[PDB]
Design a binder for this molecule. Structure first.
Ligand SMILES: O=C(O)C1=C[C@@H](O)[C@@H](O)[C@H](O)C1
Length: 260
């Protein structure tokens, strides 16, 4: 069989479940695809650069996760699709000797959501894609962080940006904190409790464990959701791109969800 290599770049990367779900898809769709893909986790040092490694490893495609999504937007050769407005790339595909960047987090998030406004905690690649998607949907979006990082990007989208927690009710409260595993509460406990009591959904991008952020929502009987569904939808969308759009995301999603 013709073989193709794929991977996920991140730091850390041990917890990624992308290899498990992508490999299940490559194994079954090799008949329709006429090639056998294999997907591996790739721990990249914080300063090494993505493009050199992508090419050296001979990859046909890759995902990018924390803390490299903004860098991926900068180093890819061409940005296509909604990524153009996300300031972040989580999917790389080698197309006619160009490293092309896409963003499947935006739509993956949308599809994961079964709301009028949202508060996003975070300023990295994930937060950026989510802000882009939520503004596109017609929600009011507030972004809360500890510094002015990413201010230009979020303000140009039309988001309200804060460093002090805004005294407002939010339908969605989203933990998209950057370069973090989400083991800790991202805000003061009482501040979170206040938001959760007036909120409709507490959403955390972390998956594989119940984050303290989600636990607080659970304890308060506020609806909550971790990042599993988003992971699977964004992965299925990436797989569609890895297949050169021959396998639609709906088909990859079914296989991926089952194996996860
Ligand atoms: O944990 C993972 O494997 C991933 C998580 C998200 O950041 C995704 O955007 C990324 O493509 C893969």
């Amino acid at each position: 069989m013709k073989l193709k290599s794929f991977g996920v770049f991140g730091n850390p990367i041990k917890h990624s479940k992308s290899p498990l779900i992508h490999n299940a898809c490559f194994l079954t769709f090799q008949k329709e695809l006429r090639f056998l893909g294999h997907y591996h986790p790739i721990l990249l040092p914080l300063e090494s650069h993505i493009k050199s490694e992508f090419l050296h490893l001979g990859l046909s495609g890759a995902n990018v996760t924390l803390p490299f999504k903004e860098r991926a937007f900068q180093v890819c050769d061409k940005i296509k699709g909604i990524a153009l407005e996300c300031g972040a790339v989580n999917t790389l595909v080698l197309e006619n000797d160009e490293l092309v960047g896409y963003n499947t987090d935006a739509l993956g998030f949308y599809l994961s959501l079964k709301y009028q406004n949202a508060l996003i905690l975070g300023a990295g690649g994930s937060a950026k894609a989510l802000a882009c998607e939520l503004k596109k949907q017609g929600l009011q979006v507030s972004v809360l962080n500890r510094s002015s990082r990413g201010l230009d990007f979020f303000q140009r989208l039309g988001c309200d940006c804060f460093m002090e927690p805004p005294k407002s009710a939010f339908d969605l409260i989203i933990n998209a904190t950057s370069a973090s595993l989400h083991n800790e509460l991202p805000l003061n406990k009482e501040v979170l409790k206040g938001y959760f009591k007036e909120g409709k959904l507490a959403y955390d991008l972390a998956y594989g464990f119940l984050t303290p952020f989600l636990s607080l929502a659970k304890e308060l009987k506020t609806p909550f959701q971790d990042g599993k569904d988003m992971l699977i939808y964004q992965a299925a969308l990436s797989f569609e791109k890895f297949s050169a759009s021959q396998i639609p995301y709906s088909k990859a999603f079914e296989v991926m969800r089952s194996v996860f």
